[PDB]
Design an enzyme around this catalytic site. Structure first.
Site, PDB file in Angstrom:
ATOM      1  N   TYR A 114       0.846  -1.183   0.000  1.00 42.09           N
ATOM      2  CA  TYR A 114       0.000   0.000   0.000  1.00 42.09           C
ATOM      3  C   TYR A 114       0.898   1.257   0.000  1.00 42.09           C
ATOM      4  CZ  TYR A 114       0.582   1.059   4.965  1.00 42.09           C
ATOM      5  OH  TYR A 114       1.216   1.342   6.206  1.00 42.09           O
TER       6      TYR A 114
ATOM      7  N   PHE B 172       3.590  10.047   1.499  1.00 48.78           N
ATOM      8  CA  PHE B 172       2.857   8.795   1.766  1.00 48.78           C
ATOM      9  C   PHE B 172       3.505   8.078   2.938  1.00 48.78           C
ATOM     10  CE2 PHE B 172       0.301   7.977  -2.261  1.00 48.78           C
ATOM     11  CZ  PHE B 172       0.846   8.960  -3.058  1.00 48.78           C
ATOM     12  N   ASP B 173       2.702   7.304   3.647  1.00 48.46           N
ATOM     13  CA  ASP B 173       3.102   6.086   4.342  1.00 48.46           C
ATOM     14  C   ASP B 173       2.990   4.916   3.369  1.00 48.46           C
ATOM     15  OD1 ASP B 173       3.469   4.078   6.454  1.00 48.46           O
ATOM     16  OD2 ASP B 173       1.252   3.834   6.506  1.00 48.46           O
TER      17      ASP B 173
ATOM     18  N   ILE C 173      -8.796   0.487   9.504  1.00 47.42           N
ATOM     19  CA  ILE C 173      -9.954   1.363   9.447  1.00 47.42           C
ATOM     20  C   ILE C 173     -11.069   0.715   8.647  1.00 47.42           C
ATOM     21  CG2 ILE C 173      -8.693   3.584   9.733  1.00 47.42           C
ATOM     22  CD1 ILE C 173      -8.894   3.830   6.688  1.00 47.42           C
TER      23      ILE C 173
ATOM     24  N   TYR D 281     -10.565   7.970  10.563  1.00 47.55           N
ATOM     25  CA  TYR D 281     -10.262   8.331  11.966  1.00 47.55           C
ATOM     26  C   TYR D 281     -11.177   9.403  12.572  1.00 47.55           C
ATOM     27  CZ  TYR D 281      -6.101   5.562  10.972  1.00 47.55           C
ATOM     28  OH  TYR D 281      -5.287   4.531  10.598  1.00 47.55           O
TER      29      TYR D 281
ATOM     30  N   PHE E  50      -5.668   5.921  -0.585  1.00 45.87           N
ATOM     31  CA  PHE E  50      -4.730   4.816  -0.682  1.00 45.87           C
ATOM     32  C   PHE E  50      -4.680   4.292  -2.116  1.00 45.87           C
ATOM     33  CE2 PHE E  50      -3.905   3.803   3.918  1.00 45.87           C
ATOM     34  CZ  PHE E  50      -4.943   4.435   4.506  1.00 45.87           C
TER      35      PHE E  50
HETATM   36  C1  LIG Z   1      -2.795   6.172  12.683  1.00 42.89           C
HETATM   37  O1  LIG Z   1      -1.685   5.299  12.933  1.00 42.89           O
HETATM   38  C2  LIG Z   1      -1.098   4.922  11.745  1.00 42.89           C
HETATM   39  C3  LIG Z   1      -1.724   5.048  10.515  1.00 42.89           C
HETATM   40  C4  LIG Z   1      -1.078   4.597   9.359  1.00 42.89           C
HETATM   41  C5  LIG Z   1       0.143   4.001   9.469  1.00 42.89           C
HETATM   42  C6  LIG Z   1       0.770   3.868  10.695  1.00 42.89           C
HETATM   43  C7  LIG Z   1       0.167   4.331  11.838  1.00 42.89           C
HETATM   44  O2  LIG Z   1       0.806   4.148  13.044  1.00 42.89           O
HETATM   45  C8  LIG Z   1       0.426   3.008  13.829  1.00 42.89           C
HETATM   46  O3  LIG Z   1       1.970   3.272  10.908  1.00 42.89           O
HETATM   47  C9  LIG Z   1       2.401   2.202  10.070  1.00 42.89           C
HETATM   48  C10 LIG Z   1       2.369   0.903  10.804  1.00 42.89           C
HETATM   49  C11 LIG Z   1       3.001  -0.202   9.971  1.00 42.89           C
HETATM   50  O4  LIG Z   1       0.998   0.495  10.911  1.00 42.89           O
HETATM   51  C12 LIG Z   1       0.785  -0.545  11.909  1.00 42.89           C
HETATM   52  C13 LIG Z   1      -0.695  -0.593  12.049  1.00 42.89           C
HETATM   53  C14 LIG Z   1      -1.627   0.118  11.356  1.00 42.89           C
HETATM   54  C15 LIG Z   1      -3.103   0.002  11.604  1.00 42.89           C
HETATM   55  O5  LIG Z   1      -3.629  -1.028  10.767  1.00 42.89           O
HETATM   56  C16 LIG Z   1      -3.934   1.290  11.503  1.00 42.89           C
HETATM   57  C17 LIG Z   1      -3.425   2.371  12.449  1.00 42.89           C
HETATM   58  O6  LIG Z   1      -3.771   1.725  10.143  1.00 42.89           O
HETATM   59  C18 LIG Z   1      -4.843   1.605   9.356  1.00 42.89           C
HETATM   60  O7  LIG Z   1      -5.898   1.113   9.716  1.00 42.89           O
HETATM   61  C19 LIG Z   1      -4.601   2.186   8.001  1.00 42.89           C
HETATM   62  C20 LIG Z   1      -4.791   1.089   6.947  1.00 42.89           C
HETATM   63  C21 LIG Z   1      -3.648   0.064   6.948  1.00 42.89           C
HETATM   64  C22 LIG Z   1      -2.335   0.786   6.716  1.00 42.89           C
HETATM   65  C23 LIG Z   1      -2.143   1.858   7.827  1.00 42.89           C
HETATM   66  N1  LIG Z   1      -3.298   2.846   7.903  1.00 42.89           N
HETATM   67  C24 LIG Z   1      -3.160   4.170   8.008  1.00 42.89           C
HETATM   68  O8  LIG Z   1      -4.128   4.883   8.292  1.00 42.89           O
HETATM   69  C25 LIG Z   1      -1.740   4.760   7.987  1.00 42.89           C
HETATM   70  C26 LIG Z   1      -1.778   6.259   7.564  1.00 42.89           C
HETATM   71  C27 LIG Z   1      -2.265   6.538   6.141  1.00 42.89           C
HETATM   72  C28 LIG Z   1      -2.372   8.033   5.807  1.00 42.89           C
HETATM   73  C29 LIG Z   1      -0.993   8.617   5.828  1.00 42.89           C
HETATM   74  C30 LIG Z   1      -0.478   8.418   7.234  1.00 42.89           C
HETATM   75  C31 LIG Z   1      -0.404   6.950   7.693  1.00 42.89           C
END
Ligand SMILES: COc1cc2cc(c1OC)OC[C@H](C)OC/C=C/[C@H](O)[C@@H](C)OC(=O)[C@@H]1CCCCN1C(=O)[C@H]2C1CCCCC1
Length: 126
Positions: free
Chosen positions: A45, A53-54, A73, A99, A116
């Site tokens: 992703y 991006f992450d 999410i 969120y 995404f």
């Molecule tokens: C809000 O916190 C974060 C959000 C996001 C990435 C984060 C993060 O720090 C915990 O760090 C990356 C690590 C690998 O992730 C582990 C678990 C993620 C979880 O599954 C939750 C927190 O993430 C999600 O549900 C979604 C979907 C899967 C990938 C991560 N995503 C995010 O929201 C990203 C976010 C995307 C927008 C740009 C900033 C990072």
């Protein structure tokens, strides 16, 4: 850019049809099966605030999660459940499916819209 394209052309894959989760398939996958609740899912992703991006590549390994188990999410549980193996999809997500008003600082502000690109690598049954 890609977020505006999804706003303009994306399908609304929400049950409520509130445009909370908008999708475009950018590369088609194979197979009559999409993942269902419980499955372990493997993705790559690229994600970003739609503001600008992450990525799983940053960490040189796939992102792994169980569908519908609240580990990701709402928009992911909804969106990935529609995807075939090998598919690349773009999602644009209103805060209600990510969120919310609370946000998740420091990475996510209140009331954030997210974008995404997801590639569905594989999934395996519970
Ligand atoms: C809000 O916190 C974060 C959000 C996001 C990435 C984060 C993060 O720090 C915990 O760090 C990356 C690590 C690998 O992730 C582990 C678990 C993620 C979880 O599954 C939750 C927190 O993430 C999600 O549900 C979604 C979907 C899967 C990938 C991560 N995503 C995010 O929201 C990203 C976010 C995307 C927008 C740009 C900033 C990072």
């Amino acid at each position: 850019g890609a977020p505006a394209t999804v706003t303009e052309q994306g399908e609304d894959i929400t049950s409520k049809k509130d445009r909370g989760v908008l999708k475009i398939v950018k590369r088609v996958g194979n197979g009559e099966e999409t993942p269902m609740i419980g499955d372990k899912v493997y993705v790559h992703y690229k994600g970003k605030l739609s503001n600008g991006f992450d990525s799983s590549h940053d960490r040189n390994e796939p992102f792994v999660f169980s569908l519908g188990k609240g580990q990701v999410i709402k928009a992911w549980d909804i969106g990935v459940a529609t995807m075939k193996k090998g598919e690349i999809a773009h999602l644009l997500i209103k805060p209600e499916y990510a969120y919310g008003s609370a946000g998740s600082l420091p990475k996510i502000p209140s009331n954030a819209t997210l974008f995404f690109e997801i590639e569905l690598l594989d999934f395996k049954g519970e």
